Design a protein around this motif. Sequence first.
Motif, mmCIF file in Angstrom:
data_model
loop_
_atom_site.group_PDB
_atom_site.id
_atom_site.type_symbol
_atom_site.label_atom_id
_atom_site.label_comp_id
_atom_site.label_asym_id
_atom_site.label_seq_id
_atom_site.Cartn_x
_atom_site.Cartn_y
_atom_site.Cartn_z
ATOM 1 N N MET A 13 8.370 -9.956 7.705
ATOM 2 C CA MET A 13 6.912 -10.360 7.442
ATOM 3 C C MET A 13 6.592 -10.269 5.912
ATOM 4 O O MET A 13 6.212 -11.156 5.219
ATOM 5 N N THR A 213 -3.248 5.279 4.923
ATOM 6 C CA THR A 213 -3.440 3.742 5.147
ATOM 7 C C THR A 213 -2.714 3.028 6.163
ATOM 8 O O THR A 213 -2.820 2.231 7.118
ATOM 9 N N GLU A 216 -3.088 4.088 9.583
ATOM 10 C CA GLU A 216 -4.471 3.357 9.990
ATOM 11 C C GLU A 216 -4.174 1.940 10.548
ATOM 12 O O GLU A 216 -4.704 1.663 11.551
ATOM 13 N N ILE A 217 -3.564 1.290 9.586
ATOM 14 C CA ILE A 217 -3.182 -0.174 9.846
ATOM 15 C C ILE A 217 -2.372 -0.403 11.271
ATOM 16 O O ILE A 217 -2.868 -1.079 12.199
ATOM 17 N N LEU A 220 -4.481 0.378 14.339
ATOM 18 C CA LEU A 220 -5.226 -1.007 14.527
ATOM 19 C C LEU A 220 -4.598 -1.915 15.301
ATOM 20 O O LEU A 220 -4.818 -3.119 15.395
ATOM 21 N N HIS A 221 -3.073 -1.789 15.671
ATOM 22 C CA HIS A 221 -2.281 -2.680 16.009
ATOM 23 C C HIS A 221 -2.157 -3.805 15.165
ATOM 24 O O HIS A 221 -1.954 -5.082 15.496
ATOM 25 N N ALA A 222 -1.833 -3.541 13.707
ATOM 26 C CA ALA A 222 -1.342 -4.484 13.030
ATOM 27 C C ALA A 222 -0.327 -3.865 11.938
ATOM 28 O O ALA A 222 0.111 -2.588 12.547
ATOM 29 N N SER A 223 0.302 -4.355 11.270
ATOM 30 C CA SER A 223 1.203 -3.678 10.416
ATOM 31 C C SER A 223 1.057 -4.057 8.985
ATOM 32 O O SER A 223 0.668 -5.206 8.642
ATOM 33 N N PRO A 224 1.295 -3.284 7.835
ATOM 34 C CA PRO A 224 1.172 -3.718 6.451
ATOM 35 C C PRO A 224 2.325 -4.250 6.045
ATOM 36 O O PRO A 224 3.158 -3.903 5.930
ATOM 37 N N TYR A 225 1.961 -5.655 5.546
ATOM 38 C CA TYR A 225 2.770 -6.287 4.780
ATOM 39 C C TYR A 225 2.375 -7.331 3.653
ATOM 40 O O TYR A 225 3.048 -7.598 2.736
ATOM 41 N N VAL A 226 0.944 -7.789 3.824
ATOM 42 C CA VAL A 226 0.316 -8.543 2.746
ATOM 43 C C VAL A 226 0.235 -7.656 1.415
ATOM 44 O O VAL A 226 0.720 -8.382 0.375
ATOM 45 N N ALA A 227 -0.429 -6.682 1.518
ATOM 46 C CA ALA A 227 -0.566 -5.620 0.269
ATOM 47 C C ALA A 227 0.794 -5.508 -0.177
ATOM 48 O O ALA A 227 1.120 -5.492 -1.507
ATOM 49 N N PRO A 228 1.618 -4.792 0.511
ATOM 50 C CA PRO A 228 3.067 -4.814 -0.181
ATOM 51 C C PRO A 228 3.629 -5.881 -0.600
ATOM 52 O O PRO A 228 4.191 -5.710 -1.848
ATOM 53 N N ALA A 230 2.275 -8.353 -1.975
ATOM 54 C CA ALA A 230 1.427 -8.646 -3.212
ATOM 55 C C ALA A 230 1.778 -7.652 -4.542
ATOM 56 O O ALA A 230 2.012 -8.053 -5.662
#
Lengths: 306, 306, 306, 306
Positions: A13, A213, A216-217, A220-228, A230
């Motif tokens: 991702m 954070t 927290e993501i 919420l049943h998502a995973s952090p990849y957009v900010a990483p 960017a």
Amino acid sequence: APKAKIVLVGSGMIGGVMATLIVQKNLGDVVLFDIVKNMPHGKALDTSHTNVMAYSNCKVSGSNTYDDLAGADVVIVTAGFTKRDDLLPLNNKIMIEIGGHIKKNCPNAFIIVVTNPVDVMVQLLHQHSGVPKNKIIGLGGVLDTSRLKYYISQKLNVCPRDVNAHIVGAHGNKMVLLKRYITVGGIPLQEFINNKLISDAELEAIFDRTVNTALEIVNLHASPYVAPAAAIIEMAESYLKDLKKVLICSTLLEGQYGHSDIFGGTPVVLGANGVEQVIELQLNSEEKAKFDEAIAETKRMKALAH
Amino acid sequence: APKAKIVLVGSGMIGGVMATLIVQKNLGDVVLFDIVKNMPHGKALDTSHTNVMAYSNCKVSGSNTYDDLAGADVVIVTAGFTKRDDLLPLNNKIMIEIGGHIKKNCPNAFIIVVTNPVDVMVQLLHQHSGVPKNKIIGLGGVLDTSRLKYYISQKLNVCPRDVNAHIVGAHGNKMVLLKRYITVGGIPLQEFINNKLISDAELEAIFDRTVNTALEIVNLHASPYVAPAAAIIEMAESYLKDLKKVLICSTLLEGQYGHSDIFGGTPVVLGANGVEQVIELQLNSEEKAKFDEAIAETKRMKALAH
Amino acid sequence: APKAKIVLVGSGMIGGVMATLIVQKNLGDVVLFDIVKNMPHGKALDTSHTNVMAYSNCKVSGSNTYDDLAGADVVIVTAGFTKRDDLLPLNNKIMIEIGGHIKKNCPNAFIIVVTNPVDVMVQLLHQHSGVPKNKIIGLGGVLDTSRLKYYISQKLNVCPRDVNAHIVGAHGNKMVLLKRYITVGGIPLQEFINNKLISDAELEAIFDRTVNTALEIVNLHASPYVAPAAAIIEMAESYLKDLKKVLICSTLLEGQYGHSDIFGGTPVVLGANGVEQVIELQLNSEEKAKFDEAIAETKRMKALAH
Amino acid sequence: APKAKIVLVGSGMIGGVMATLIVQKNLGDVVLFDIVKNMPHGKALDTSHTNVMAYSNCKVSGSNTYDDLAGADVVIVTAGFTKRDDLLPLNNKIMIEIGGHIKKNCPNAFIIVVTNPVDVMVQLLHQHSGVPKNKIIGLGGVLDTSRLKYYISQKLNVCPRDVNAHIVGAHGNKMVLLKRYITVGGIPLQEFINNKLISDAELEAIFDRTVNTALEIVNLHASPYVAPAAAIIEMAESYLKDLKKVLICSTLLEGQYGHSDIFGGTPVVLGANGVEQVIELQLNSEEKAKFDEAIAETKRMKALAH
Ligand SMILES: O=C(O)c1cc2cc(O)ccc2cc1O
Ligand SMILES: O=C(O)c1cc2cc(O)ccc2cc1O
Ligand SMILES: O=C(O)c1cc2cc(O)ccc2cc1O
Ligand SMILES: O=C(O)c1cc2cc(O)ccc2cc1O
């Protein structure tokens, strides 16, 4: 042609958003490399069409062959297991394999390591790739501070970029948030506290939220990849375009903060020569104590990795 | 259509760069207005063709009719004599004329005044246009600080945008340069002084150069209009796109720094509601003394203008 | 650093807009070179401050020394007298002088010639600089077609960039406007004529206006430099970023359209290797006749230049 | 504030790239709406941090409440089952539900439908939402043509954007690829065929590849969402910024190509008034026959949907 070649070692991702952004910004040709057969070719194909929408001309190709590292100007490593200390030795073996291929195929590449825990994995890759200390960094502070900056900006109703902040030592749960180095439009945050535009208690909540954070993501049943993604591209772009941005990254410490022979998060200057400067914040004893705990944890995990 | 309409009252050199930049950024339709017959039509025509190169769709038209102010979302005033205290009453008459047309044709426009001395001319226009205090500002601090930021950045070998700095009180020779509010990548400049990356004496030279930049450019047989233009557009864009950037501009003081019923340079927040916030720096007595001298000079010239 | 170095040989109005745009686009370091003492230093200084507003990091320096051509990646020549056939031999001498310095200092530079009449001056510079035929072009078709495209787009109420058109042979009054090669959103213009969205008579007026645009602007008491500047930068950017855009430029003909040993306007592909392709339009006999008149005029003026 | 509000009805993969791109482009505040609890909040949070990297100020929020459609300027519908004719009536029910909420909450919104088969689903939403025919379109031609343009551009070694092409009638397997309307730098493709730079057989292979691209990507174990996302954003941006781009989209036919009371792919002009123009290509009988087959298939599926 002398377009930059950017190889994304790992096409999950984070890799897919990075490729998108590189095309959007016309930063260079992209190779989406992965161990998984055919998937990187499919993402590459999808991504390639966006050259039309973006007015760009970047090749985007998939790869299951390490020799496609040849000629890379930039290498971004996201590969590694994520499903805990038990993964440390497995991810060490992956860094070893990648490092050997970098040494062979692209020893002059600028390297950005993302694989967690990053302050450990970056040093392992440094050691196995043989690259100079100014040519390899880890993603940490740009990402962690994006959260802190963003959250303060929304409270103060100002442009997110106008909040600046420093988080040092390590990525992850021992990250050191430095209240004293927060500014808003270049003004010390303390002035906004004195004025009652933001309270100390609010900031403590924002600090906790910052540290937590990624959790927290995930919760919420998502995973952090957009900010990483960017954040990595901001780093990669600074290198490629010789912007000389001050960006907080994991880099080899050679005495700063009393630490040597280890990687840790600190502001550096990224330009055409890689890490052109390592900036040592003039931390007080209480801040240095937390910096020390961060390094201790990086060291504990580095020992388990071998 | 609901594209923004941006009227440039004055189509000289600053006006021509502003029009170019608006098209480059696709910010809105442009009217180049001037008292001079036909010239604004010619510059407008030239500028309009650049929509093709820029992938934009902004109309650029010339005007010798004040009624083309009708429907303006943004009005940028550069008109006025520049060839000294004797010009003050002449430029007052120009502000009066423009103000009357704004009141009649575009009372809800956001106004940016450039005509010098700006901290005087902006208040004169405010008074004659009848617009709300949050809807009119003067160009000062974004331009003056661009110089200081740029010069420090070149000494430190960092990205220009990563230096932040504050110059307050007034535009022109009484501008107040605040050493204490300079940062580099959000870090206090004093850390870079402590480290010997930059000396106090160097900074004093840079401060002098900053104050005297317009003179330095004129004495090189050029004139400053590209940076002024870019600074104005940064301000105008913050308004139009609701960015809420912290930008130092001339704005009505209502008690800040001990001053009321006068305009002076201070950080403000520019978004969709105009001046959303006026930020008062917590100056010490020595900085407040220089702020006072700046205001005194604005007042001296305001009296001569009538 | 490996930022591109872009030397603007001539620092007049076109030079000043080019410098602005290069900074806006962060395309490379700029040298504003001119014979006039000190003025290029002043414009350079003014322009340099805009790095802050633009989030860029391009050096902008003035120069009165030809040896600053050393290391140039791109050289853009606007220098020359504009105040008629009598200027031809004077401008030849200027091309000779510049060519000698290019040969000495930057023989691998990509060269863009603007000085008029461009189809003559570009070949003179080619001959005196010694550069390869794929490394020097003249500004013509991108600028002339920007006008035609823009004017049709305003009539049809479509995005300017969505009109494409070809003007070949030469820049100036013998330019060949090819009605048959106009499209709107990639659709032949004739469909819009068949539909009565635009008439043949309207297009004839637009063609005349196109040919006479520089005159129309001069007669309005302005002068054309913003669109020329933007057109040059589109060309320079295509080279620098290896975009491989199809752009109509003055280039050495080696049999295309029946012409050799002369420069003339035709679509080319501009990328990292300079002129990568010369595209020969499959003109009919009536279009080839006008192409021939354009070349004849370039030849007449080339003879007078010596 | 008068920033645009853009609600993404569906927060899956296409939704996540759209949100990223909106922030990158600072196009407006984003709501990621989905039926799935909490996931859109997590993606929104991740995406929000990128404002810092992008120098933007767009809110990005998650939503599980249809009433957050209130005040939407743009609504982009990706929601629907993808795991065949049996899904048609289920997806009809989803369009019905969404349409009712649009009618109630944002009847003046501009609507872009993505859910497949799009030429069916867009008309179902049109009918249930009650919006004007100029205020709703479907994604088709921008995406399909991005593939054709890209593939030709790589063969010809030109900038992707410089190839223009038309695919009409419907999205999906009955899409009509119009060889006669392909251009390269505005030049008819046939000239490049006459010159042997590209063969008829090559183009036939490229046409097949174009029609089968989504399948090719799926068979590589990826799925198409980056190009779909970029295509939608190009459309949305044209509307929001009043660019008046000619873009091929699914729109209500009222006699064009002999068809009424159905949606089909054709070039339209997208600006501030939505679909400002519907462009009818002057197809020959053989092209009209294929257009007819595309419409017949849209009609067959529309009947099954009820
Ligand atoms: O987003 C982050 O900050 C983050 C941080 C960390 C830290 C860590 O130690 C493991 C995994 C992650 C994953 C992440 O997404
Ligand atoms: O560029 C500047 O800072 C500047 C400043 C001032 C100040 C002033 O009082 C008159 C004129 C100018 C003209 C200028 O170009
Ligand atoms: O803008 C133009 O097209 C143009 C064209 C020409 C042609 C020419 O022969 C001399 C000077 C100019 C000056 C110009 O500004
Ligand atoms: O990418 C495409 O063109 C595409 C097209 C279609 C067409 C269709 O009928 C169903 C699903 C898809 C999914 C897709 O991703």
